[PDB]
Write a protein that binds this ligand. Structure first.
Ligand SMILES: Nc1nc2c(ncn2[C@@H]2O[C@H](COP(=O)(O)OP(=O)(O)OP(=O)(O)O)[C@@H](O)[C@H]2O)c(=O)[nH]1
Ligand SMILES: Nc1nc2c(ncn2[C@@H]2O[C@H](COP(=O)(O)OP(=O)(O)O)[C@@H](O)[C@H]2O)c(=O)[nH]1
Ligand SMILES: Nc1ncnc2c1ncn2[C@@H]1O[C@H](COP(=O)(O)OP(=O)(O)O)[C@@H](O)[C@H]1O
Ligand SMILES: [Mg+2]
Lengths: 376, 428, 427, 365
């Protein structure tokens, strides 16, 4: 069983080599087909978004507290999942303001929790993987739930942890496609119309500057750019940035609830075999308090905040009306977000509303321009 | 003495008050110094010495015009601490005059008026003169008005604001100021007498036959208006009417409180000889739309109420006859639900002509405080201009950059739309 | 009392300021010494806004003189009304910009900016309520451009409340006086649109046309052009320095003129411009003043207004007049030239009747129009700039000074954005 | 010699190990491919839903060489989705008001077959997702409905292009583990009697709800040829149009008044997984819309109008053609409807008759 063993082993080697050749050919074919399917679904999903959106306005109302529910609350009429009606209880308010009905992409019930958020993030992260620059806006007044929805709580995390985990599992799955994704974490604060750094305590000078490659691409000089290596690394970075942004939010309402924190995650996917590179970035940006400036103590920067908010409103409505030029350069926040606002870039617009009477004017203000955005 | 005090904000307010107070001190033979070489106590807190200080509070955010009056012939007339001055004008901003300079001087002016009120025994009401396009006259005026309504509430607050002209807007940003100040004043204004520069321009053109009219002449006219208004207090008449009866007689509803003034015998001296100036004819004249002090057509709107103030040599029989005739008129429309509104203010103190003035010496004069539907279109076009500005968000950066939100702009806009809605629904 | 701080950068700016100060002193009856000798106390009443008080009844202009070569300042000091300045104010380098913006904004500016900002602060604190700063310079040269932009960027970042006045002398379209003025202008406007909030664009070609044709002048010396510009500049603030029926100020018209933060470039205009001997033939009344001040023949900028639309117009008047005429004539011109006015700003005219006319004159009008015709000028400059950019003409002189070409790309893109704004609001 | 044996043993071991790991990677990639393809189909049908439901299109056709002496009308084209027609009779121009119609898309006589197939092709992919698709050509006699559906060998109609794209997609998807079977039935409805177009064996033919889906319809006695390649289906269509008995030469009332129903059922199965699809393509060539049988046409119009009205009850079983397309007019499905218009003055009233149907369609949606 030795001489015939040589022939048997030669035949076995021939068969195994044939199987190797077939599996390699079909593996190259299936890699190519997987890439083709991925780009086909990229284009299909982007067409879906453009037909249904490309400027998405989402409205959410937080549930009142057990003591604040006994506090007077307005009647909330949900005509459907897309329209919500707010009616002030006051008779004179009813007579003068009349009916306040508003149209949005989707209306959140106070008991909707964070699930609808996740199922809107899923197409959002999907489009982020398409190589598209997507920006997120957490607009609203203080205490309306903006910090509850963005950062969240240990029992129910906000949008950011869910997005981080979804992105990490997505990139680890796409590693099976030979795609190597480099993700960059950038943190900055916009106060007094001058940029600051969240990762570095030392006081440096920022200036907005278009990137070397393209005029439309923008970066900021002298920022602390961190290469994300593991999810927990990113979580620790976000914790340090949240710790660095320590100031009065509700006790004094000094700078927090009056600042513009921009969280930009620049993702650069590379695939060496086909020498194609995908570039994208997500912008988790929370807005400042939209309240009317009444503190005579530091009213100037509140007026600047109002300027910033009004300029953002002007920019978005210019986006809607197909205006030839859109005033990106009127404000720092718009100017540094111009790549994420124009062209194929897609914006989610998130608004939080307070269910009490003192925010009736502010709730109406928050709702009216967003509904106007929905109209056009 | 049911005395009253007057407030003057903005260049217009101060100029108008200058003309007014010169007319007043002319009425009672008061020298510019402040002594008469009783009646006047309503407006002059005369001290032990012959120094009849007027009960006037002049406020401005820039020192120019106030300093001028502090240099004019009436510097020693006024109490030197009355004249309050800022350092920078509101520059057509409601925002400045309501948030950034207004609260920086409002404590002082409120204190001074509190002192004045405590000085008065029987407080009758307040007079304020301002504009709408004026940054001070809008922002500061609204702030002070709501502040007073907080302080007193019960007293009488009368605005002699100057409505922006329909054809000429000296300030490009007038609609914003007008809408904002109206929204913030509606709920704190007892009754706001409105007047316009274009209309009084036409009047001095075709009636005074003045070819080069200056702001002085318009101010003479407004001074005559206010003198007629206050004659019933400063003087005794067959039927005296105080400011209190005005709210009752004129406004049918809290929001509809924008009468428009009129003054009939406005002829020049040369034409004075060709007319007898009868009661009936001047009564008819005051209803001529060409004689209104606001550029609107009363012919196109029904009247809500009419208050007529007669001064000089007048007889009640004639007044009743003329009113009956006007009731018989057809072009003169009236709403049904108030079929009798003609509260009369006959008085027998003839108006006095300022030396160097343009008016003629007339035996009898009438002032008409009409309230009518014919103002709805003025609001309509003002709101239209505001919508034009706001559609492009023009100039909004100045306002949101100094105290407010464009959401607040929308609040004032929809509030005005509701006002026009209520106004027309009353009209039917 | 709303005092104003005057800065003069570049030799152009220095000469213009010399003319401006002499005409102002003429207005207030100030001798070369500084001893007042006028008669109207109104001169004293607001004398503070431009003059600091001096011991012994003297007055000194609240002025700052900046340059990088001494010669112009030596001429000024030697010239009449030279001693009027407080000698400490003359701040100057020794090198000279050499018509290079890069030098005057990165090296000589770097070394002189503190030596001038100190006296800037010293003057500022010597004021009751600071109103704003007026900067006089030119966009063509080196120091008046680089230094001017540097000073603007400095002043803005620690005086954000105040207002900035820049009477930039915009480069001429045809008679170019500098082979590289495209680069200077493009780099300057990049800073200008960010910090200042009202800019008076002036062109020398337009002023040549004015003096030669309307004035029938044959020897248009720079003295005359500067005299014209100075008259306009004094007329801008006479409402601030004097009483009137509608007292305006820099704050007043600042908000009126600019619908949007970036669109703050204006075309001045001064009405009564009778020639040497034609004053006899012409009656001087409001109609003439208005119709003259609304002629493309009369704009100090070289843009034809008829090619665009007036976003906003201000009309400041001096002298004794009845505002009825001015109201009706503004209405009239608003009606006739409705094609020339933007539709969505009704009644886009601002009136500021003052009282005191310029000496030797009865009525005077200053025009400030924020028309869209400026976009043609900016297109012309952008075309000239990009024409000599990709050939890198004269680029080395800048690049070796410590700047990168992406800075040129930045400025060019920004100015193209300005052009986009203007052409967009044309409709 | 045993050294060669040991070397071959270690080579066999390494080759089997590498083959096993490569196969595991291969299968994982195949699973990823399937998970991507299902989402692709879902996104495609989402696009179809977002684009609309009725998909109103008008296809104006040029006059022929024998129609050059006829009188046309004033075609007022607006943008690309609105069209207006006017009679050149100036006396009746002031008596017609506003004869303007806005649809989803407008096709002018310069549009080729490719322009229509651009809109039609994504519906083939949608049918591959297991959904029923309908293509309708509506108009009066001579409008061009047969040219839209069948066309000419020079410029092929919608059906050949749909078949070609279907086979291209089937052979592209063969790598995705799915196998498809094409079932073709050719049928004609003349006077509420069903006629088989692939057999001359006249029998009795009836419609009954499907045994495995009460909402689905299977027709008894129909021949169901399994299409192997485009040549086979072309031969089937050739035989069907031969069997149609085109009596245009003598008695044109037979051909130009009969509805032609072409049904193409797509079924997709997946071994080693679960996949059930019954998506079918109903390529119906409607009869003439001329006023006078018309039971089927009026019933189709009423059913479409009620479906766009979200009516509680749909009159599906009041005609043969409606009940035939009862599972093909569901809410989840996507419907296409073309209006062919003759640009002639004599056809102006028939043109507006064909166009006011869509005018009610878009005003009801
Ligand atoms: N009838 C009359 N109206 C005047 C007179 N003077 C000014 N006005 C009007 O009053 C307004 C003057 O503006 P102000 O109220 O003083 O505003 P301001 O105090 O300067 O603050 P800004 O508006 O921001 O500049 C103008 O709109 C004029 O139309 C006057 O003498 N008589
Ligand atoms: N109106 C006016 N313009 C001048 C005068 N002198 C120079 N200019 C302009 O200023 C520009 C020269 O730039 P400039 O600032 O003087 O050079 P720099 O001082 O070295 O930066 C040229 O375009 C001239 O047209 C002057 O006396 N009057
Ligand atoms: N776009 C076109 N170009 C040329 N000929 C056409 C066109 N459309 C239709 N036809 C002509 O119309 C005939 C088809 O008849 P058709 O009008 O479709 O019948 P039906 O009245 O049933 O719709 C063809 O013979 C063809 O010559
Ligand atoms: Mg046919």
């Amino acid at each position: 069983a030795l001489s015939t063993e040589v022939v048997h082993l030669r035949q076995r080697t021939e068969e195994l080599l044939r199987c190797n050749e077939q599996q390699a050919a079909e593996l190259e074919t299936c890699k190519e087909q997987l890439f083709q399917s991925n780009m086909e679904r990229k284009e299909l999903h982007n067409t879906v978004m453009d037909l249904r959106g490309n400027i998405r306005v989402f409205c959410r109302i937080r549930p009142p507290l057990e003591s604040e529910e006994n506090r007077m609350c307005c009647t909330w009429t949900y005509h459907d999942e897309s329209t919500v009606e707010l009616q002030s209880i006051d008779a004179q308010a009813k007579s003068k303001m009349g009916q306040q009905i508003f149209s949005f992409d989707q209306v959140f019930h106070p008991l909707s929790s964070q699930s609808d958020i996740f199922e809107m993030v899923s197409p959002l992260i999907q489009s982020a993987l398409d190589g598209y620059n997507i920006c997120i806006f957490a607009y609203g007044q203080t205490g309306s739930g903006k910090t509850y929805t963005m950062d969240g709580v240990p029992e129910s995390v906000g949008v950011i942890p869910r997005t981080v985990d979804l992105l990490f599992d997505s990139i680890r799955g796409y590693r099976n496609l030979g795609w190597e994704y480099e993700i960059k974490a950038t943190f900055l604060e916009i106060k007094n119309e001058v940029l600051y750094d969240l990762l570095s305590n030392e006081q440096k000078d920022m200036e907005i500057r278009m990137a070397k490659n393209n005029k439309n691409d923008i970066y900021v000089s002298n920022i602390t750019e961190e290469t994300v290596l593991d999810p927990n690394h990113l979580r620790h970075l976000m914790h340090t940035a949240k710790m660095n942004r320590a100031t009065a939010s509700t006790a004094g309402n000094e700078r927090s609830s009056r600042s513009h924190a921009v969280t930009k995650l620049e993702l650069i996917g590379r695939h060496a075999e086909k020498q194609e590179i995908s570039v994208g970035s997500i912008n988790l940006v929370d807005l400042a308090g939209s309240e009317s400036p009444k503190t005579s103590t530091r009213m100037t920067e509140t007026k600047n905040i109002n300027r910033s908010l009004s300029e953002l409103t002007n920019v978005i409505l210019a986006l809607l009306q197909k205006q030839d030029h859109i005033p990106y350069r009127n404000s720092k926040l718009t100017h540094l977000l111009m790549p994420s606002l124009g062209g194929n870039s897609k914006t989610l617009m998130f608004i939080n509303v307070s269910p009490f009477q003192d925010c009736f004017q502010e709730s109406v203000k928050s709702l009216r321009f967003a509904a106007s955005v929905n109209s056009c | 003495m049911r005395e009253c005090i007057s407030i003057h904000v903005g260049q217009a307010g101060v100029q108008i008050g200058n003309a007014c107070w010169e007319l007043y001190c002319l009425e009672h033979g008061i020298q510019p110094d402040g002594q008469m070489p009783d009646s006047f106590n309503t407006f002059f807190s005369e001290t032990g010495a012959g120094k009849h200080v007027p009960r006037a509070v002049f406020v401005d955010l820039e020192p120019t015009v106030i300093d001028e009056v502090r240099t004019g012939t009436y510097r020693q007339l006024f109490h030197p601490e009355q004249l309050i001055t800022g350092k920078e004008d509101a520059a057509n901003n409601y925002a400045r005059g309501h948030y950034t300079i207004g609260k920086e001087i409002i404590d002082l002016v409120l204190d001074r008026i509190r002192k004045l009120a405590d000085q008065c025994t029987g407080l009758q009401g307040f007079l304020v003169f301002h504009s709408f396009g004026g940054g001070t006259g809008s922002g500061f005026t609204s702030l002070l008005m709501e502040r007073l309504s907080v302080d007193y509430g019960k007293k009488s607050k009368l605005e002699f604001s100057i409505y922006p002209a329909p054809q000429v807007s000296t300030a490009v940003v007038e609609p914003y100021n007008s809408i904002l100040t109206t929204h913030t004043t509606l709920e704190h204004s007892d009754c706001a007498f409105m007047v316009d520069n274009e209309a009084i321009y036409d009047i001095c053109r075709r009636n005074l036959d003045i070819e080069r009219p200056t702001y002085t002449n318009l101010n003479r006219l407004i001074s005559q208006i206010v003198s007629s208004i206050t004659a019933s207090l400063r003087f005794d008449g067959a039927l005296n009417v105080d400011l209190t009866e005005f709210q009752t007689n004129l406004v049918p509803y809290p929001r509809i409180h924008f009468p428009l003034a009129t003054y009939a015998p406005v002829i020049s001296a040369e034409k004075a000889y060709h007319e007898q100036l009868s009661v009936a004819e001047i009564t008819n004249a005051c209803f001529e739309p060409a004689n209104q002090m606001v550029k609107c057509d009363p012919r196109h709107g029904k009247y809500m109420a009419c208050c007529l103030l007669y001064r000089g040599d007048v007889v009640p029989k004639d007044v009743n006859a003329a009113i009956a005739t006007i009731k018989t008129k057809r072009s003169i429309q009236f709403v049904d639900w108030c079929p009798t509104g003609f509260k009369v203010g006959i008085n027998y103190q003839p108006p006095t002509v300022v030396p160097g003035g343009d008016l003629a010496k007339v035996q009898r004069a009438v002032c008409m405080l009409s309230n009518t539907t014919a103002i709805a279109e003025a609001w309509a076009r003002l709101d239209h201009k505001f919508d034009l500005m706001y559609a492009k968000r023009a100039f909004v950066h100045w306002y949101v950059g100094e105290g407010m939100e464009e959401g607040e702009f929308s609040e004032a806009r929809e509030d005005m739309a509701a006002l026009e809605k209520d106004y027309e629904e009353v009209g039917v | 009392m709303r005092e104003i701080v005057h800065i003069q950068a570049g030799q152009c700016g220095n000469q213009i300021g010399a003319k401006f100060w002499e005409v102002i002193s003429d207005e207030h009856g100030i001798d070369p010494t500084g001893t007042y000798h006028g008669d109207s106390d109104l001169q004293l009443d607001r004398i503070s806004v431009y003059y600091n008080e001096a011991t012994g009844g003297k007055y000194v202009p609240r002025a700052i003189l900046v340059d990088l070569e001494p010669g112009t300042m030596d001429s000024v000091r030697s010239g009449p009304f030279g001693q009027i300045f407080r000698p400490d104010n003359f701040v100057f380098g020794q090198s000279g910009a050499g018509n290079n913006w890069a030098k005057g904004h990165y090296t000589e500016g770097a070394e002189l900016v503190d030596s001038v900002l100190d006296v800037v602060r010293k003057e500022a604190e010597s004021c009751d309520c600071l109103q704003g700063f007026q900067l006089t310079h030119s966009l063509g040269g080196g120091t008046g451009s680089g230094m001017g932009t540097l000073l603007i960027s400095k002043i803005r970042e620690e005086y954000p409340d105040r207002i900035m006045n820049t009477f930039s002398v915009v480069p001429s379209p045809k008679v170019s006086d500098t082979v590289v003025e495209p680069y200077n202008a493009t780099l300057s406007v990049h800073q200008l649109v960010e910090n200042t909030d009202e800019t008076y664009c002036i062109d020398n070609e337009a002023l040549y046309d004015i003096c030669f044709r309307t004035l029938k002048l044959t020897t248009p010396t720079y003295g005359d052009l500067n005299h014209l510009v100075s008259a306009t500049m004094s007329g801008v603030t006479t409402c601030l320095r004097f009483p009137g029926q509608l007292n305006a100020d820099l704050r007043k018209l600042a908000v009126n003129m600019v619908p949007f933060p970036r669109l703050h470039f204006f075309m001045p205009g001064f009405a009564p411009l009778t020639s040497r001997g034609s004053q006899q033939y012409r009656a001087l009344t409001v109609p003439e003043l208005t119709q003259q001040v609304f002629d493309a023949k009369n704009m100090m900028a070289a843009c034809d207004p008829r090619h665009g639309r007036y976003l906003t117009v201000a009309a400041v008047f001096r002298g004794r007049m009845s505002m009825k005429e001015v109201d009706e004539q503004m209405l009239n011109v608003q009606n006739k030239n409705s094609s020339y006015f933007v539709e969505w700003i009704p009644n886009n005219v601002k009136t500021a009747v003052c009282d005191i006319p310029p000496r030797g004159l009865k009525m005077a009008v200053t025009f400030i129009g924020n028309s869209t015709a400026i976009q043609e000028l900016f297109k012309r400059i952008s075309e000239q700039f990009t024409a000599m950019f990709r050939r890198k003409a004269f680029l080395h002189w800048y690049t070796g000074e410590g700047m990168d070409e992406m800075e040129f790309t930045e400025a060019e893109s920004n100015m193209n954005d300005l052009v986009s704004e203007y052409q967009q609001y044309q409709d």
